[PDB]
Amino acid sequence: YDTTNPQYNSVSRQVEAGDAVSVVGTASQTMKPNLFYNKFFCGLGSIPLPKLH
Amino acid sequence: TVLTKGEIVLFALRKFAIASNASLTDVEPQSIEDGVNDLEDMMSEWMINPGDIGYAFATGDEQPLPDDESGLPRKYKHAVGYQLLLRMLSDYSLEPTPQVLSNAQRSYDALMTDTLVVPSMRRRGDFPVGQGNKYDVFTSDRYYPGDL
Amino acid sequence: TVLTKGEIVLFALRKFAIASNASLTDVEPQSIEDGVNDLEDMMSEWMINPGDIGYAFATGDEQPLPDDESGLPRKYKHAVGYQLLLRMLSDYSLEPTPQVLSNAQRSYDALMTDTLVVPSMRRRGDFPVGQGNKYDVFTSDRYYPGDL
Amino acid sequence: TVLTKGEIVLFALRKFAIASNASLTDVEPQSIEDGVNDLEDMMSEWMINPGDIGYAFATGDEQPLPDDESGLPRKYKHAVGYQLLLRMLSDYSLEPTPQVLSNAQRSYDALMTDTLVVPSMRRRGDFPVGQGNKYDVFTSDRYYPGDLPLIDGDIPNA
Amino acid sequence: TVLTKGEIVLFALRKFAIASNASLTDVEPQSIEDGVNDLEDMMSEWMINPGDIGYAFATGDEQPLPDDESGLPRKYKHAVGYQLLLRMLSDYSLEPTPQVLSNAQRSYDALMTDTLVVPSMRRRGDFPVGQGNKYDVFTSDRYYPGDLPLIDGDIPNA
Numbered sequence: 001y002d003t004t005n006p007q008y009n010s011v012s013r014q015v016e017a018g019d020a021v022s023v024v025g026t027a028s029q030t031m032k033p034n035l036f037y038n039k040f041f042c043g044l045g046s047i048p049l050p051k052l053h
Numbered sequence: 054t055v056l057t058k059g060e061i062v063l064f065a066l067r068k069f070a071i072a073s074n075a076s077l078t079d080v081e082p083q084s085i086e087d088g089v090n091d092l093e094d095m096m097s098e099w100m101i102n103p104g105d106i107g108y109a110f111a112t113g114d115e116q117p118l119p120d121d122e123s124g125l126p127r128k129y130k131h132a133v134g135y136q137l138l139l140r141m142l143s144d145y146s147l148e149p150t151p152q153v154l155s156n157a158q159r160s161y162d163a164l165m166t167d168t169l170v171v172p173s174m175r176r177r178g179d180f181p182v183g184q185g186n187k188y189d190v191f192t193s194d195r196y197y198p199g200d201l
Numbered sequence: 202t203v204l205t206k207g208e209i210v211l212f213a214l215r216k217f218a219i220a221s222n223a224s225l226t227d228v229e230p231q232s233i234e235d236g237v238n239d240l241e242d243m244m245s246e247w248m249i250n251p252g253d254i255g256y257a258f259a260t261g262d263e264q265p266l267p268d269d270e271s272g273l274p275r276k277y278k279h280a281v282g283y284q285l286l287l288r289m290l291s292d293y294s295l296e297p298t299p300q301v302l303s304n305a306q307r308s309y310d311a312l313m314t315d316t317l318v319v320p321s322m323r324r325r326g327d328f329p330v331g332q333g334n335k336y337d338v339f340t341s342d343r344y345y346p347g348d349l
Numbered sequence: 350t351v352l353t354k355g356e357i358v359l360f361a362l363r364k365f366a367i368a369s370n371a372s373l374t375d376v377e378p379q380s381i382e383d384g385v386n387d388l389e390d391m392m393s394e395w396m397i398n399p400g401d402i403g404y405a406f407a408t409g410d411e412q413p414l415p416d417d418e419s420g421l422p423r424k425y426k427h428a429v430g431y432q433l434l435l436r437m438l439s440d441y442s443l444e445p446t447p448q449v450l451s452n453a454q455r456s457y458d459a460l461m462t463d464t465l466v467v468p469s470m471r472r473r474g475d476f477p478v479g480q481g482n483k484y485d486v487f488t489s490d491r492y493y494p495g496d497l498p499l500i501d502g503d504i505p506n507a
Numbered sequence: 508t509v510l511t512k513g514e515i516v517l518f519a520l521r522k523f524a525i526a527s528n529a530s531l532t533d534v535e536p537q538s539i540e541d542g543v544n545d546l547e548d549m550m551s552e553w554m555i556n557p558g559d560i561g562y563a564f565a566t567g568d569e570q571p572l573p574d575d576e577s578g579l580p581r582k583y584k585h586a587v588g589y590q591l592l593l594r595m596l597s598d599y600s601l602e603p604t605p606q607v608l609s610n611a612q613r614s615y616d617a618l619m620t621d622t623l624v625v626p627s628m629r630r631r632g633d634f635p636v637g638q639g640n641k642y643d644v645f646t647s648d649r650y651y652p653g654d655l656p657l658i659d660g661d662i663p664n665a
Contacts, residue, residue, distance in 0.1 A: 048189070048191050048192045049192070050189060050192055050194050051189055052658065052663055053658075054565070054568045067541070067598055068597055068598060069597060070597070070598060070599075070600050073598060074535065074537045074538060074541070075534070075538055075598055075599055076600075081223070083221075083222055083223040084223075087215075094275060094278055094279060095279070097274075097275040097276055097278075098275075098276050098278075098279055098280075098308065098311060100276065101276065101311055101314060101315055102311050102314060111202070113202060114202065116202075127548065127551050128548075128551045128552045128554065128555065129552075130548050130552075131548055131549065131552055131594075132552075139300070139304070140279075140304055142300065143216055143217060143218070143298070143300060143301055143304070144215065144216065144218060144221075145218065146217075146218050146298075148298070148300065149300055150597065150602060151602075152593065152596060152597065152602060152603055153597055156593065156594055156597075160552070162556075163552055163555050163556050166555050166556055167555050228371060229371060231370045231371060232370075232371045235363070235370065242423055242424075242426055242427055243427065245423050245424050246423075246424045246425075246426075246427055246428075246456070246459065248424060249424065249459055249462060249463045250458075250459045250462055250463075259350075261350060262350060264350075287448065287452070288452060290448065291364055291365060291366075291446065291448060291449050291452070292363060292364060292366060292369065293366070293372075294365070294366050296446065296448065297448060
């Protein structure tokens with residue numbers, strides 16, 4: 001939330017002090033989460049290695 | 054056999070006879086504190102050109118004392134003492150002698166001999182690597198890295 | 202330990218034996234404040250030729266006082282003090298000695314060694330980049346950007 | 350903060366101990382007047398060769414007074430005071446010392462470095478512009494202007 | 508034989524006549540103590556430019572003792588004493604003479620000629636050996652050995 005460059009706003013209002021927050025989940029639950037994403041979210045590569053003489 | 058700031062300063066004062074057993078003169082307290090803080094400042098300045106040589110500094114807000122352990126190696130004692138004498142003599146307005154200057158230069162040269170680097174310039178980075186090294190075609194090993 | 206203008210001025214006065222703690226005769230505070238003023242103007246003038254070394258100046262209206270801190274590191278103390286000594290001996294109508302001149306030159310050379318930085322000449326701006334840099338896909342430039 | 354001709358003259362006198370505050374307890378108003386007049390004349394002379402540096406001359410016709418403000422930045426005062434000292438030392442018949450000469454030389458050299466211009470070499474005017482500069486589409490013509498080029502069009506004579 | 512440090516110090520004093528056996532006035536013990544101390548600092552520094560020459564040091568942080576055996580050959584004592592004298596003259600407020608300087612230089616050169624190095628630089632390692640040396644399949648030797656790094660399967664990069 002930039003008041004000098006409004007071009008890059010990505011949220012309705014600024015996170016001011018005293019705002020209400022919460023944590024999603026349970027106290028100490030353990031689970032195996034599902035996932036969802038776009039193609040251009042993460043990227044993976046494998047570096048080839050050099051031969052030792 | 055560890056060195057001390059008091060020992061190094063006393064060596065410098067005896068070397069020009071400002072205070073020594075050969076003469077009947079005895080150390081004045083004011084001369085010793087001046088030697089100690091001048092030595093500390095000279096080492097702080099030396100941290101650049103000759104390079105780090107192992108001096109142990111005084112922890113902040115605490116003044117250095119003649120009984121503190123300097124931590125310097127024994128072999129650097131003559132060089133450090135002669136440099137201290139050269140930057141000390143102006144206090145009593147004495148004039149260095151040619152033999153003193155020659156000894157100081159010899160000690161400085163001997164100290165500097167042990168700190169040479171010769172950085173040994175490396176390759177360029179786009180220099181081709183020959184076919185005699187049998188490079189790996191997929192890897193980016195057809196050319197020299199030539200960086201950090 | 203924090204360096205102060207008063208400490209620098211006292212060091213400069215002591216190094217040529219004009220006034221010191223051990224002396225039985227001492228100089229009026231008028232001389233001390235004249236010395237600190239000379240330091241202030243000299244270091245303000247130093248903003249052009251040698252460069253910036255982190256010195257802190259008086260905040261506009263306020264005059265400089267010896268008790269305040271200059272902010273310089275311990276390394277530059279001898280350089281600053283020796284230059285102030287060379288600029289202040291004429292006030293008492295004296296002549297620096299060759300050893301003092303040599304020491305001041307050595308410390309000033311150390312200061313230049315610390316401050317030195319060398320530039321790099323960028324490409325002209327109409328210099329072709331070459332087909333081997335993949336200017337069709339990998340790089341958007343057919344010619345080097347030039348100075349920024 | 351503020352630079353005063355009186356303090357410049359006092360610095361010039363003190364730096365050679367003609368009238369100091371430690372050795373001697375005397376300052377002479379005749380010396381002060383001579384010093385300020387010499388400073389005024391020297392600045393008037395300097396207005397041409399080294400170039401203007403921001404000094405302010407006395408408006409009207411009344412003589413300058415030491416309490417006035419010079420307007421010089423504090424980074425020039427050492428050079429100004431040294432160059433003044435060398436000029437006025439003949440009156441007390443005191444010859445200068447090599448250390449003073451060296452200090453004045455370094456201060457003047459620093460001022461010279463601060464006041465450099467190093468102008469560049471403009472094009473001749475009949476030198477052709479290359480065919481690759483795309484004239485008839487860009488603002489460029491076949492040839493370089495050789496004079497300051499038109500910036501507006503409302504004022505076209507210059 | 509023994510060639511004690513105190514003997515070397517007394518030699519250094521004698522060749523400048525600070526105090527000898529045929530002298531009514533002699534030096535006090537702490538002068539000899541400082542002489543031996545400076546001797547050992549100089550010899551410890553001598554482990555850089557001239558190199559180790561067989562000096563024996565005090566192990567177990569004991570203060571230097573004048574009557575301990577230095578462990579140097581007798582063919583070094585003049586050089587050591589002359590170099591010690593040049594460092595110690597200032598303490599007695601005296602200056603060296605041309606004959607003493609020449610003798611010290613001659614003895615130092617005599618010591619130097621006994622510790623030559625001649626590093627005799629090697630061949631590259633990619634320099635081919637000729638076909639006339641009759642190299643073999645098993646012992647390699649088709650190219651001259653070089654630095655020959657010892658590469659371990661572990662620690663591949665280094």
